[PDB]
A paper describes a structure:
Calreticulin (CRT) is a 46 kDa soluble multifunctional protein that was initially identified as an endoplasmic reticulum (ER) chaperone for monoglycosylated proteins and is also involved in Ca2+ regulation. Similar to its ER membrane homologue calnexin (CNX) ectodomain, CRT is composed of a globular domain, into which a flexible arm-like P (proline-rich) domain is inserted. The globular domain is made up of seven concave and six convex β-sheets forming a legume lectin fold. We have investigated the CRTs of two distinct parasites, Trypanosoma cruzi (TcCRT) and Entamoeba histolytica (EhCRT), for which a pathogenic role has been proposed.
The purpose of this HsCRT mutant was to disrupt an ionic bond observed in all previous crystal packing(s) that stabilizes CRT molecular arrays. As expected from the mutation design, a new crystal form has been obtained, with ten independent copies now present in the asymmetric unit. The residues of the conserved lectin site (analysed below in §3.3) do not participate in the packing interactions in this new crystal form. Compared with the previous native HsCRT structure, the largest deviation was observed for its N-terminal extension, which, in the absence of interaction with a neighbouring lectin site, is more flexible and found in different orientations up to Val21. The part of the junction and linker region (LPGSGD) which was not initially defined in the wild-type (wt) model has been rebuilt in most of the copies. The final average root-mean-square deviation (r.m.s.d.) between the wt HsCRT structure and the different HsCRT D71K copies is very small (0.3 Å).
Residue numbers in the entry:
A (entry chain C), B (entry chain F): 19 to 207, 302 to 367
C (entry chain B): 18 to 203, 303 to 367
D (entry chain A): 18 to 207, 302 to 367
E (entry chain I): 19 to 203, 303 to 367
Amino acid sequence: PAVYFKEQFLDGDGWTSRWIESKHKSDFGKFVLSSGKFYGDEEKDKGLQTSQKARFYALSASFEPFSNKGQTLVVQFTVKHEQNIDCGGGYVKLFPNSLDQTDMHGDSEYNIMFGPDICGPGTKKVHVIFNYKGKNVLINKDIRCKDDEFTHLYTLIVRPDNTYEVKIDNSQVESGSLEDDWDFLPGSGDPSIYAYDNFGVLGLDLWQVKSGTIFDNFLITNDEAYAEEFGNETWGVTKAAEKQMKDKQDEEQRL
Amino acid sequence: PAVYFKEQFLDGDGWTSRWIESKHKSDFGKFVLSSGKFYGDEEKDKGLQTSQKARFYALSASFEPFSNKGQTLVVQFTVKHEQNIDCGGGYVKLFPNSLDQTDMHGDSEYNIMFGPDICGPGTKKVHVIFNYKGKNVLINKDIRCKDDEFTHLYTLIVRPDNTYEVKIDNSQVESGSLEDDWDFLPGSGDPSIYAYDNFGVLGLDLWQVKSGTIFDNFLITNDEAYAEEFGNETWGVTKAAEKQMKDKQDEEQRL
Amino acid sequence: EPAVYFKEQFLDGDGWTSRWIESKHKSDFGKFVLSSGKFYGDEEKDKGLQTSQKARFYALSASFEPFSNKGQTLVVQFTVKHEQNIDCGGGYVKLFPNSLDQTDMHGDSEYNIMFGPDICGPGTKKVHVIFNYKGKNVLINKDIRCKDDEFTHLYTLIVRPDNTYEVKIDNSQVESGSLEDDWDFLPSIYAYDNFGVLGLDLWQVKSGTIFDNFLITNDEAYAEEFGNETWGVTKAAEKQMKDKQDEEQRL
Amino acid sequence: EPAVYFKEQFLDGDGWTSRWIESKHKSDFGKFVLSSGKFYGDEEKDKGLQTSQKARFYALSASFEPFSNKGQTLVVQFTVKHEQNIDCGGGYVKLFPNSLDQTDMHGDSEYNIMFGPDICGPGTKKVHVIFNYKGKNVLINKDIRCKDDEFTHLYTLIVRPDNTYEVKIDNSQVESGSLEDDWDFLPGSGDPSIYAYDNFGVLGLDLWQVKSGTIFDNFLITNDEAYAEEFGNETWGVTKAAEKQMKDKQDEEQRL
Amino acid sequence: PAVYFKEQFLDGDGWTSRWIESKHKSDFGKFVLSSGKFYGDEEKDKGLQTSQKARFYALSASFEPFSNKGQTLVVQFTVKHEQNIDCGGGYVKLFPNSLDQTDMHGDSEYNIMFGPDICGPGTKKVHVIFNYKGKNVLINKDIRCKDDEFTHLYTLIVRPDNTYEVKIDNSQVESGSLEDDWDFLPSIYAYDNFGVLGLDLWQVKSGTIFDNFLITNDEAYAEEFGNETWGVTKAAEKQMKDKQDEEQRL
Ligand SMILES: [Ca+2]
Ligand SMILES: [Ca+2]
Ligand SMILES: [Ca+2]
Ligand SMILES: [Ca+2]
Ligand SMILES: [Ca+2]
């Protein structure tokens, strides 16, 4: 089982030597390390938290490059919109190793984008975007994302038969084939759409009105079963204690 | 969070000094340490396996005694009927510390009995039995147990307001109040039914026709959230890889 | 002639639920239940309020027609039974002014007097006698040992208008003196303009304590009578039933 | 674009009496009155809340639409004028959570932040900056001198989501730094959420005064530093020169 | 084995909720979490580092109180004077639970003080101090401490027969009986209550790192833990430092 990338932010400020802030603009919001006001475990549940309102963010982590050619690609992470978000992204981008991390921005060329996007009551959507022939192609299926304040697990699975699966909280919510669920081409044909020569950076590149979202437990792997295990060892261990602590705070607030 | 008992059989043959065979009869079947023919992890998934057909079994483990008076009691363990069982029990019993472990048998006085029981096409049931006023009182709700070959998590939660909950695979399948869901009394009124002065031994005391059932990951605790965590760190880590290995063996069999 | 300001024996089934009020100051207070426990002198008479949950704060109270002890003897009396062999927890009462909001009662609510047994581990087996004076809660300076076995014990506080006091356990004096000598107060120290509520407001690790036979009166002799009609009637049969259960346990 | 969470200039006659609430926690609180005092830049503009009684506690507060500073800059700003040449008394504000019962406000009510000048005798001329954290009221460890003459002075506190702060007097910086360094909150790096409060709903004047006569005016709670500075120049900055001129004239007449 | 206290600072900033700064003075030096310039493992070898020169320090950790009465008491921790110290303490103090951690200072009443003290070429000494009858009684044996830049394990063993042993780097350096090796005025060894471990000390050149604190009643367990901590640090630390010394020379 290949682990191309793992990040749990368990080693204090260690993460500040693994991630790079884009300088494309001077006024990007800053991520901070935090487990927020409630959590399952104060230390384990530390992740990157958006710290400023109405800002663009642009922070990224490089890893030893790889190709998903001939293989399964699994992209997984947790997202927690502690602040009860009104409008903002919670998605990740996988970039070719040719990306200059210090110049990353909204129009930098990525391979794949994946994850939750919220904007008002009307948009609660999971993006699955594939870059193909210089276009960023959006999935045609409507996948609802989570919108409460708790930690949710997001998983994208992409297979070399051009099938894909999306999971939320380790449970399937959408499935199918690339050729059907995106408009890449007028008719069937190109079995290589799923495949990228090179993956070298994972970026958080996004916009937020109300800030406070925490990203944790990032995993890039080629094994679906391992992804599921890791999901149960991370999200699955956070879940119940987080909910208990938050119920308790809600009750005290009410009094 | 109090952990009154935990057993995962992770330290080789260490378990043989924690569990005691009843000598009440000379012909009890024997438990053996085994992860069986398929598993998620050959080592982690070791547990106690029934090794002989058409036998009574009687093995138990003592722990520092406790009372659940004024507190939540959670009893949890995994069961795997690898052999595709026809008829046999998969339940545990919690006994007072006054039990002589070398004389344990079917008629020994327990406090609580909990878990799956299978007998032919008609019976796939989860027992929840409370000992009260010298009677063993059986739950009136019909709870279906699992019957496939895979590992399943069984959880009983008993609370000091006389509520209870039963979970399978970390997900609620039944809930209510002791006074409603058992015939202890003709009408309501004994709020202490849930409570026992002492718990000192967990026993596997049961009958099996076709043998091969594996018991693992026993937990007795006072914390529902911790039980759920441990469930996701045990069953939740076994699940996907176990299924994948077994599908592979089924496919090889078909050829 | 004796004035009875408050009496509670929990003799009329669930009648008590309309005389006592649960504080809602917090959402996770432990709950009292009506019970005579596993052993008793009389299954019905020895019903009282039992703490039902471990490691919890409790806050339950009862009102009565307000009164003042000014110019009078005040006697506060009740039974306490730590069935569970308590490790750490209170068994004391508090007398409050009628200005107390019973639905907001908690550890920091202002009381007039606090009285009764407090146990915490090997070191503490003590009877509290606390007087509220000049916005301070003043603790008795004498060391009074409380009972700690599993049986029912009678606790009695007597306060007199010459500022003398007496403490009794099981109807027998264990301590006495004057307010001015036995507390560090900043002449009617003893006196309160009004009493309107009795509260059980306390903490408990191991739960199972039973409170019964509460009495507030102005007559020492009557308190002693009532003690002998309640505790004194419980005592022997309770001990006998428990001895029998201990013997069966051993076999 | 700047958010204005609270503004009070007392420009609309007795209108303020429907925006502020007196605590009844005690029966003998001093009373605020509307006044521009004996000298002023403009008789009407410079009306504010004046302490009217000697040797008293005061407890008056105003609500606003609740907000959180989470992920944002918080600016708290107001003018203070100790006309009476104060001997001993507070001139500071408190920002409270919306859970405060205004009719029970007092010295021990739980606030989020306290900010402003405190004078007591020759030794104490100090600007308080207090943060409530983990049930403690933590006092700034830097020594900031307040103004003590009879004129109107502008007090501004700026708190930023990187846990930096700045204090200004008369629109000019007098102190700055980081929350982790300038208060004793906790060991190590610090806690990136210290600056942040889930909610702000009430501004209170809750304080003690020997010699009375202090006037509070031109309150502003905003999320924009630049706007705070503008408003400061449109209020204090417009009061300043005329106030000083009228007072010089009165001092000269007094001499003759 | 009873483990009354263990601290390895393995859980990021988790330690900031276990340790309390004294406010007795306003100008105490500040401890910072760090593995320094060289180490065996960047993560494991994080500990509390003194961060300022010519300062008093006063930081403490409470634990569930206990008594050593009728038992062995073992106090153990690692000390690394990375800065090549000129003058400064590297010792711990065990306090009764009656200590106000927010007022801890040099004159607070402790039960036992133990560990290295360096001041100039003349003083390289291991303190073992027992509080008895309101006096702080100093061991009368001369125990040399380590003074290089590397991580060293310090272990004090006190037994209910009034014997004691001192180890450096898991190897005995001193032993005897309380009655012979101190001038006390039979349970000298015993204290009713232990509730706080404090780092309360003075330092000229700063940079000392404390890690791997252990309070236990089992000598063998202390030795095991020493080998799993100091014993796992030692070789890789030395390797990394040799490499840095060579590069510095060129
Ligand atoms: Ca994490
Ligand atoms: Ca196992
Ligand atoms: Ca009764
Ligand atoms: Ca005005
Ligand atoms: Ca360490």
